[PDB]
Symmetry: C3
Subunit: 368 residues, 3 copies
């Protein structure tokens, strides 16, 4: 029972689900173990929908940072006088400000849309609600919260008229995720600004995690990363994004983060992870697709790819974070110390220790 | 028992009080309902004094954002090497940095002074204190806390001297007696008080006026990340249903009455309601739609915590309406009605913000 | 039992100790009295090592701000591509970023080394751990948390070798080693105040307050980047036996003061409307925290010197209620001093005049 390990089978809680897709909400990072108190204000959401669909209009009391793991979508954020549609592609990330009304469309014909997002509530710490404008079989419209009187006066109309149009108390859809008409997708799909290279640093439009070169990358893997330094949207939430791939058989050499708390979500493949903590303590765990493992700050950890892997990671508290490796050539901290100290540190000679470290000729990612 | 309603009648606790005035402190926001856990740090104090009086010099361990609701006043903050005075008129606001000694005078002859201030304690969350320098029959000066031996050393006189001239009198902190001002270009002053109504309202029609100042324009507010708003609503008039994007609004009923309807999710929408009167506080969480139906000429103030980059969204009316911006094809998918029906419906309320009931 | 009084006799706790040095970590401020909630995120660490020793390479999930109370030290910071060493002198302060690896050397031959540090955790509020790279009799190296498969794989070596060459915390040294590690080590200077990397010295500046009875040294988030990032003022003062720091009160800064050397009595006052008095006799290595806007006074019963960390110190203000300079009650209006004191406008002025010195006076 690794506190830092959350099994999907028993850590997710479906909010809405039907034939057109479902939305699941991870559990409270702290409810699991008080050891994760510093994350009580964060949540994990997973959205998956079937081809040619739309998530009816709604807004929530929580900022969101969504990452499109795969598929294609059209995010539309409606304001009080403006509207803005974007065409998110795989690897594309954007930030939906709190209290913003918006809807999602899956223009694709065969492919699905799997979006995973980090939610940050405004009112209740760690908790947030979804307010749907629409009047569906599965949810009332918040407009039904008001009295008939306030309604008759607000819209300037008789109730039966506003009920036979906006509410409907059979004429209303089944759930909040209904199918669309090609003519419609044909019509919604033409004005959504899409991600490009000139967006890496835009306070608005979405940016592509992979559009740039990785930071580390060899025949055994690739580590794509973005930090507040480079992105305005990421400086505000003070978080870093990094999608990293690892070829079956290779692993991410032992390393620790200086001051970032990482939340990695396995996106594809399998993996064996190891976490050391304080007499040291091991915290291994066998992760699978959709599993979430949170790695405390200043904690060495290694990732073993037991099959072609790709995982997403959120770096909470990222401003000026550094990645220290314990093995390999480049960025190895146990190889910068003064010899005499290496001599005094572990039981070995300065040369005997200068020998065991120069063996491994690769850096970052190696092959098992 | 609506958790978002703080009825004055059974919600305030008197701090000091006499013939010249009283100071009341509203109960803890979270002690009321855990839902307001995010409002634990704030306190809403209510100051009231009669003509020709003064609040003895005193300091507290909590920032203050005062807003003169009515009457005139002379606020004087005294520094360790300076001292400045200001002339507060109704509508004025200003901040009093934590640890700042100060006294208040009400120079008017027949008008009572009514001040409201949001307290932000520095030591213990949501709980602060007052430190009165004055030596009164209602409180001991903080000088009395010192050992005799130290006071003689400190001041340079045998005890009986300081004891006769400093420690001991008057009955109560508010006693009876016998200057910069807020202009139209004071609004961005980093130190002087500014005025909410000196600028144009934002939403204003024959049924009401909406005044609001944001941390964007005033250095003092940006430091607290708070937005102010004073709105007026005619009897019968109604403040169209809307919601705040990210700010948690705290509204205080100044004068008049009104019924407000907060709507929240339980999917089943649950309605929260209440009938507010003079000095009633109601806190509306972020993103929750609410309506202001005034049953008498109403005027209130509103402190919007975490107001940075906020945005106001309206459901009815012809301006700043969200429902009216949902693409044509999608309005027909969400509502049990024709995309032509909805468009027609939404276009029936010619008014904006304030409509007549 | 003064909730603000933290006696070292039963507040500190050693995380380790050996005939070569000692490291103690204070109690949780709030663990004592809830009255000190807002201090829950902080801590005080006390390091003390003999002459000619070193602290084997480690790192903690915490932001440190160490200040050297006495003696000379050599701080070596090791990053992934660099290694920086600073020649710290008494009065020198510096910041060791969260998760940074470093070791400490004491080049002195007769003196000792006493360094104090405020830890600001990053993971669990108010609680941090140490991760020592070295393998030792008092601590297992953290490279041992990994399985043998991963260690065998990473280091590209057969286990027996790694185990053979890798697997107290304050151990002795040698002249050679000392000499070696010492050469080339940038040390504090007048051109080192507003830096983000190098350590700076309090006293290498003019004290803001000083008379034949004492000196007040203070650096603020306004002058030193490293302090601005933390928003904490540092201050060291000197008060001679008999003398005493005139009653005053910080406007918004929460002060945690540690007694370096000497002895003194302290008076704090808060409301209970009656005022309550908190009094304690601070001795060497005792901690006393004075909340915001609470007036307090320090009387020295022997030549004294203490260090003070000011939390939430951005735009702080020290107000003195006694003396000639920076006297608040002296700014209040005459036509009003008369209204707030039993005395008369006249009788007060004259009295506020009796004292002639400011800040520090003779007992
Ligand atoms: C305004 O409040 C009064 C008092 O309850 C109510 O009768 C009236 O219907 C309200 N206005 C509207 C439009 O409902
Ligand atoms: C995972 O861990 C190491 C990584 O090098 C490897 O030797 C091992 O075979 C991998 N899988 C299993 C099941 O051990
Ligand atoms: C110290 O403070 C005490 C107050 O208790 C005072 O009487 C004394 O004169 C001061 N000086 C010394 C040396 O004690």
């Amino acid at each position: 029972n690794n506190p830092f390990y959350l099994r999907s089978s028993n850590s997710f809680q479906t909010l809405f689900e039907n034939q057109n897709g479902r939305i699941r909400l991870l559990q409270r990072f702290n409810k699991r173990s008080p050891q994760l108190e510093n994350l009580r204000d964060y949540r994990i959401v997973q959205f998956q929908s079937k081809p040619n669909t739309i998530l009816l209009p709604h807004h929530a009391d929580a900022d969101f940072l969504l990452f499109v793991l795969s598929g294609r979508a059209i995010l539309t954020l409606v304001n009080n006088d403006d509207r803005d549609s974007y065409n998110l592609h795989p690897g594309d990330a954007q930030r939906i400000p709190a209290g913003t009304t918006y809807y999602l469309v899956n223009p694709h014909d065969h492919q699905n849309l799997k979006i995973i997002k980090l939610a940050i509530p405004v009112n209740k710490p760690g908790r947030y609600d979804d307010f749907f404008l629409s009047s569906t079989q599965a949810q009332q419209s918040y407009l039904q919260g008001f009295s008939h009187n306030i309604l008759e006066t607000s819209f300037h109309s008789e109730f039966e008229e506003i009920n036979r149009v906006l509410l409907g108390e059979q004429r209303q859809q089944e759930g909040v995720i209904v199918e669309l008409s090609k003519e419609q997708i044909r019509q919604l799909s033409r004005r959504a600004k899409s991600s490009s290279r000139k967006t890496i640093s835009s306070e608005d439009e979405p940016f592509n995690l992979r559009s740039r070169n990785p930071i580390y990358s060899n025949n055994f893997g690739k580590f794509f990363e973005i930090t507040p330094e480079k992105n305005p949207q990421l400086r505000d939430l003070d978080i870093f994004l990094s999608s990293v791939d690892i070829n079956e058989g290779a692993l991410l050499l032992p390393h620790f983060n200086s001051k970032a708390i990482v939340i990695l979500v396995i996106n594809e493949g399998d993996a064996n992870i190891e976490l050391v903590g304080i007499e040291v303590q091991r915290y291994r765990a066998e992760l699978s697709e959709d599993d979430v493992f949170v790695i405390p700050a200043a904690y060495p950890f290694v990732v073993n790819a037991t099959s072609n892997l790709n995982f997403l990671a959120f770096g909470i508290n990222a401003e000026n974070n550094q990645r220290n490796f314990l093995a390999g050539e480049k960025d190895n901290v146990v190889r910068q110390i003064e010899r005499q100290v290496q001599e005094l540190a572990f039981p070995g000679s300065a040369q005997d220790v200068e020998r065991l470290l120069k063996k491994q000729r690769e850096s970052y990612f190696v092959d098992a």
